[PDB]
Amino acid sequence: SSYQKGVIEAAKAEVLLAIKEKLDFKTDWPRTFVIADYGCSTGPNTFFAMQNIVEAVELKNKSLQKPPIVDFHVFFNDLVDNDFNTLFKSLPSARNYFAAAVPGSFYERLFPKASLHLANSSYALHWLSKVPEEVRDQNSLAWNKSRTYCSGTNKEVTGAYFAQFRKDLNRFLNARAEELVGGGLLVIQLPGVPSGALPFNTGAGFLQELLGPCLFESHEKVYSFNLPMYFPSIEELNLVIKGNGHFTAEKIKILNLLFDAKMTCLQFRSIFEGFIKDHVDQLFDLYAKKLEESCSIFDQEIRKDVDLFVLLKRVLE
Amino acid sequence: HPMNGGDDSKSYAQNSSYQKGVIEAAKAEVLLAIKEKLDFKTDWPRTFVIADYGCSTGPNTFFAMQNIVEAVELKNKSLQKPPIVDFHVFFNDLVDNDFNTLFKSLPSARNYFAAAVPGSFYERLFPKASLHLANSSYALHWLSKVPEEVRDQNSLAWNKSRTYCSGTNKEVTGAYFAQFRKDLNRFLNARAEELVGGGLLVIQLPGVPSGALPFNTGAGFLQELLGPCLFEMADLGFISHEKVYSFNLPMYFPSIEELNLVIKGNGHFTAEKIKILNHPMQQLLFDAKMTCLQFRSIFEGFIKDHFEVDQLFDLYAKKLEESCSIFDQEIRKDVDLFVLLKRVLE
Numbered sequence: 111s112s113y114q115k116g117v118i119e120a121a122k123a124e125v126l127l128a129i130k131e132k133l134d135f136k137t138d139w140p141r142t143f144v145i146a147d148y149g150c151s152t153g154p155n156t157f158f159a160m161q162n163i164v165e166a167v168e169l170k171n172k173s174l175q176k177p178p179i180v181d182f183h184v185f186f187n188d189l190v191d192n193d194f195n196t197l198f199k200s201l202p203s204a205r206n207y208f209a210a211a212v213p214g215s216f217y218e219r220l221f222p223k224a225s226l227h228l229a230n231s232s233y234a235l236h237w238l239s240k241v242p243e244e245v246r247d248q249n250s251l252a253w254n255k256s257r258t259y260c261s262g263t264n265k266e267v268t269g270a271y272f273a274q275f276r277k278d279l280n281r282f283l284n285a286r287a288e289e290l291v292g293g294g295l296l297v298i299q300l301p302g303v304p305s306g307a308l309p310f311n312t313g314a315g316f317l318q319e320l321l322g323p324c325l326f327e328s329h330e331k332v333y334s335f336n337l338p339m340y341f342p343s344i345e346e347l348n349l350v351i352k353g354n355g356h357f358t359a360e361k362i363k364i365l366n367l368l369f370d371a372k373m374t375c376l377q378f379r380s381i382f383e384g385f386i387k388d389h390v391d392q393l394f395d396l397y398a399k400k401l402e403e404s405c406s407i408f409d410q411e412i413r414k415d416v417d418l419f420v421l422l423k424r425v426l427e
Numbered sequence: 428h429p430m431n432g433g434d435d436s437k438s439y440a441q442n443s444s445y446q447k448g449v450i451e452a453a454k455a456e457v458l459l460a461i462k463e464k465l466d467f468k469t470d471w472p473r474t475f476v477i478a479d480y481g482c483s484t485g486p487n488t489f490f491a492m493q494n495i496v497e498a499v500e501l502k503n504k505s506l507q508k509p510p511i512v513d514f515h516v517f518f519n520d521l522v523d524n525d526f527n528t529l530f531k532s533l534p535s536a537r538n539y540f541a542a543a544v545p546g547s548f549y550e551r552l553f554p555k556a557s558l559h560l561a562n563s564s565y566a567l568h569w570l571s572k573v574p575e576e577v578r579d580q581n582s583l584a585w586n587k588s589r590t591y592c593s594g595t596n597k598e599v600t601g602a603y604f605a606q607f608r609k610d611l612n613r614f615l616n617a618r619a620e621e622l623v624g625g626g627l628l629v630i631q632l633p634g635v636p637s638g639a640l641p642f643n644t645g646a647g648f649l650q651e652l653l654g655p656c657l658f659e660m661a662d663l664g665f666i667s668h669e670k671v672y673s674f675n676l677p678m679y680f681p682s683i684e685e686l687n688l689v690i691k692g693n694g695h696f697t698a699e700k701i702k703i704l705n706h707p708m709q710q711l712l713f714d715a716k717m718t719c720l721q722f723r724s725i726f727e728g729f730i731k732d733h734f735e736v737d738q739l740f741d742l743y744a745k746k747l748e749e750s751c752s753i754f755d756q757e758i759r760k761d762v763d764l765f766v767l768l769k770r771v772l773e
């Protein structure tokens with residue numbers, strides 16, 4: 111989780127800035143300030159992220175004439191099979207918030223109406239709720255037979271994947287809109303695609319590009335294999351956010367070492383082994399050799415500017 | 428220490444039917460508490476917030492919480508402008524509680540938002556004035572620790588002969604009650620901070636009726652049977668006598684008089700009702716096998732930690748079976764204390 115750690119550390123200045131500039135409940139500040147992390151995993155990364163947020167809100171608190179905030183309540187959300195035991199045992203002893211964990215998909219409601227002041231999600235929202243049905247349909251123009259993911263090179267495949275990403279993100283936004291009070295902030299970080307690029311020439315995309323042929327090395331089951339993820343462009347996020355209506359997009363930007371074949375192969379395996387198993391020795395031996403001969407490509411042909419930062423603000427009334 | 432986690436045959440989840448009976452018997456008192464004592468006048472919340480202290484791994488906690496939610500919702504719909512829009516239910520236990528198992532057991536089809544909170548209920552767990560109803564079912568007999576005096580070989584309170592406070596040794600009882608008074612008062616102070624004015628605190632715990640001692644309650648007598656099994660294991664050279672002498676559980680079973688004394692001294696709550704429930708298993712014959720597994724699911728951890736088990740519990744099972752008629756004829760069954768408290772308006 112060290113790369114994801116870096117995203118949070120890179121985003122800290124932005125989070126601090128976002129809260130300093132955009133968090134303002136006017137005459138209606140809470141005594142209990144409530145924060146939720148959507149897709150928290152098992153730590154430590156969620157603890158650093160929540161710590162940075164609490165620190166920023168504390169500064170905000172001190173900045174007001176009559177500091178309104180008495181305490182903090184932080185909620186850690188992940189899927190029901192997340193290892194919450196480990197998360198709980200890892201909670202920082204010295205912290206300034208009451209803590210709770212919440213099981214469930216973040217594509218549903220997870221919290222009471224107008225109970226949240228700030229919502230966060232770091233490196234989670236690229237995970238779709240499912241594979242789009244259309245890319246599985248042998249008779250669709252969107253049949254994604256040649257690849258494990260949306261490369262972005264195929265217009266109809268891209269249509270189906272984006273349709274799913276839009277549906278899922280819009281579901282998330284609707285849910286968070288109900289849970290956040292008016293003026294509440296929603297901070298989102300996820301891997302994406304910078305202007306002038308496509309998924310396939312980002313690191314995550316090209317990794318999938320190397321895997322697809324490895325599987326080809328049952329053909330039928332390879333043709334029907336797809337992953338439930340999407341890496342959006344800034345234009346795509348703006349379309350979804352604008353169509354949604356409940357938030358203003360206060361900021362959307364991309365935040366800023368040699369490729370390690372061995373380490374990457376181990377990390378890639380840990381993330382995707384399950385998906386492959388459900389749909390490994392022989393395969394990841396072939397993948398490790400393929401990453402090996404792709405070092406200079408990762409070093410000098412792949413876009414590394416992929417960490418999207420999104421600050422949204424819950425519209426009033 | 429938490430109960431046996433997971434969902435196997437030795438687990439708390441699989442062996443806590445007696446405790447579920449306590450919640451079952453409590454249901455009618457919960458309905459009366461809501462009907463009679465839950466009243467926020469013209470400041471009812473839109474989000475009704477409930478916390479369960481000592482929830483374990485389910486399914487009992489989900490049962491207790493569903494009964495409360497339904498009662499409150501019935502009340503809600505009986506108001507001309509039903510004020511409550513949603514429910515938020517918090518599940519609290521120690522940090523080593525098997526929350527993974529708890530969460531896999533939580534109903535995915537339900538009418539309340541849910542969260543779990545790790546930590547000792549002798550500390551603050553929630554923001555100030557955030558809760559409308561606090562629940563604790565068969566948890567508040569657990570002390571924050573064994574009293575220091577009973578571990579002290581030079582003290583008159585040295586509890587060398589028993590695993591718990593029987594009530595028969597005066598110095599041991601003094602040491603244990605002092606700890607209970609301190610602990611429960613600390614629990615009530617913390618809950619007083621967390622509950623809004625007029626909020627309810629609903630409690631059940633194992634206690635002692637008038638004219639009895641811990642010794643001749645089910646909880647006490649099961650410990651009376653454990654002590655000699657440990658002594659026997661020491662005689663047979665599996666553990667040391669020294670280790671037996673030093674073994675004590677952090678538990679106290681109070682009388683109503685004791686509870687009233689602690690409550691009255693605390694001052695943050697009015698005592699709206701204190702009564703002994705009629706347990707639904709009251710008229711059933713003792714079941715040694717099932718009681719053995721119940722008892723194991725609770726105390727296995729304590730024994731493991733102190734002594735560093737299968738053979739012990741085989742011996743224990745034998746003693747339970749042998750003592751069937753004692754449980755059936757000589758043990759007080761009027762032992763499930765129900766307590767309703769109401770946070771005073773500050």
Ligand SMILES: Nc1ncnc2c1ncn2[C@@H]1O[C@H](CSCC[C@H](N)C(=O)O)[C@@H](O)[C@H]1O
Binds near residue numbers: 115118216
């Ligand atoms: N629909 C969903 N609902 C809740 N959690 C989800 C989810 N889809 C994915 N996740 C979780 O999101 C996490 C992505 S990994 C990111 C962990 C952490 N936020 C960090 O920055 O390091 C995983 O723990 C995954 O289980």
Ligand SMILES: Nc1ncnc2c1ncn2[C@@H]1O[C@H](CSCC[C@H](N)C(=O)O)[C@@H](O)[C@H]1O
Binds near residue numbers: 446480482521563
């Ligand atoms: N200091 C403390 N803080 C929180 N939970 C505690 C505690 N001491 C004991 N407990 C918990 O209280 C529970 C007692 S068993 C009762 C479980 C449940 N309410 C039921 O009705 O079955 C255990 O889960 C134990 O771990």
Ligand SMILES: O=C(O)C1=CO[C@@H](O[C@@H]2O[C@H](CO)[C@@H](O)[C@H](O)[C@H]2O)[C@@H]2C(CO)=CC[C@H]12
Binds near residue numbers: 446565566634644760
């Ligand atoms: O939930 C618990 O912690 C327990 C739950 O139930 C307790 O035992 C029960 O204690 C009850 C109270 O005396 C009896 O009526 C029951 O027969 C008996 O099974 C366990 C016990 C035995 O020494 C002490 C406390 C423990």
Ligand SMILES: [Mg+2]
Binds near residue numbers: 254257333334335
């Ligand atoms: Mg495919």
Ligand SMILES: [Mg+2]
Binds near residue numbers: 589671672675
């Ligand atoms: Mg002893």
